[PDB]
Design a protein around this nucleic acid. Structure first.
Ligand SMILES: [Zn+2]
Ligand SMILES: [Zn+2]
Ligand SMILES: [Zn+2]
Ligand SMILES: [Zn+2]
Lengths: 130, 130
RNA sequence: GGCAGGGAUUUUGCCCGGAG
RNA sequence: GGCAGGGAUUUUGCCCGGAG
């Protein structure tokens, strides 16, 4: 197993530095306690325009072992949706050009308006509570 | 002299608390050193919609003596322009409905895009450099 | 994303889900 | 307001003025 499916949240991200880390809470579908850190480089972020991540945002991804540690290959939001980033987007896909009613993609589960988590909604967001 | 003209910047403002203080740098036109604190209540701010002030924003106002100290009566930006506040507006008047080209008001001097100071421009803003 | 209203010294509380 | 590109552990640098 060289290519593995990961899911967690953004641990931290330095936008100027172009990198950060992900806190991997589930590896290959199985839950992780304590979470394991996975490196992210801006170039591997599925986003429209300028790439970045925001601390705590929900990510799903694929990763591999590297000489420096664990390296993510492609980083998306839950369900392959675009990431949020830092410094108005479709409720279904995160796309900037349109709204959920005009979305060409298959319907996706409701994601937290703040962090994109599929587990809660904005009104009960732990990240927002900061 | 009951009713006085003052000018300075906002010292601090607590939006939930509905009040703050102004750091008056010029009383009745004459320069003050050290500056003197003047109380502001949200109800006295010349603004469209939700009233607040942001630390350091340029402010022009009228004040009076009160049992508790100095109390501002009406608070505007330099030249009677709307205040900025906290949490798009015309470059000439601070109005939300339009842009400088369509402004019906007489031309006002250029104000810092960040703090509304008439003395500098955003690219050299001390407040922004924080 | 939306909505506001604790008057005397320090940086804001609340509400939102198959749709803006 | 605008523009981006420092690959391995911590939250971003730059540029903008009689006009968006
Ligand atoms: Zn969409
Ligand atoms: Zn959330
Ligand atoms: Zn105007
Ligand atoms: Zn300024």
């Amino acid at each position: 197993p060289q290519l593995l499916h990961g899911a967690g949240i953004c641990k931290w991200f330095n936008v100027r530095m172009g990198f950060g880390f992900l806190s991997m809470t589930a590896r290959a579908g199985v839950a992780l306690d304590p979470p394991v850190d996975v490196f992210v480089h801006q170039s591997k972020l599925h986003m429209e325009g300028f790439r970045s991540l925001k601390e705590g945002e929900a990510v799903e991804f694929t990763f591999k072992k590297s000489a420096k540690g664990l390296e993510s290959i492609r980083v998306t939001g839950p369900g392959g949706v675009f990431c949020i980033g830092s410094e108005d987007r479709c409720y279904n896909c995160g796309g900037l050009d349109h709204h959920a009613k005009e979305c060409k993609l298959p319907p996706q589960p409701k994601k937290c308006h703040f962090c994109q988590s599929i587990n809660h909604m904005v009104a009960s967001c732990p990240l927002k509570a900061q």
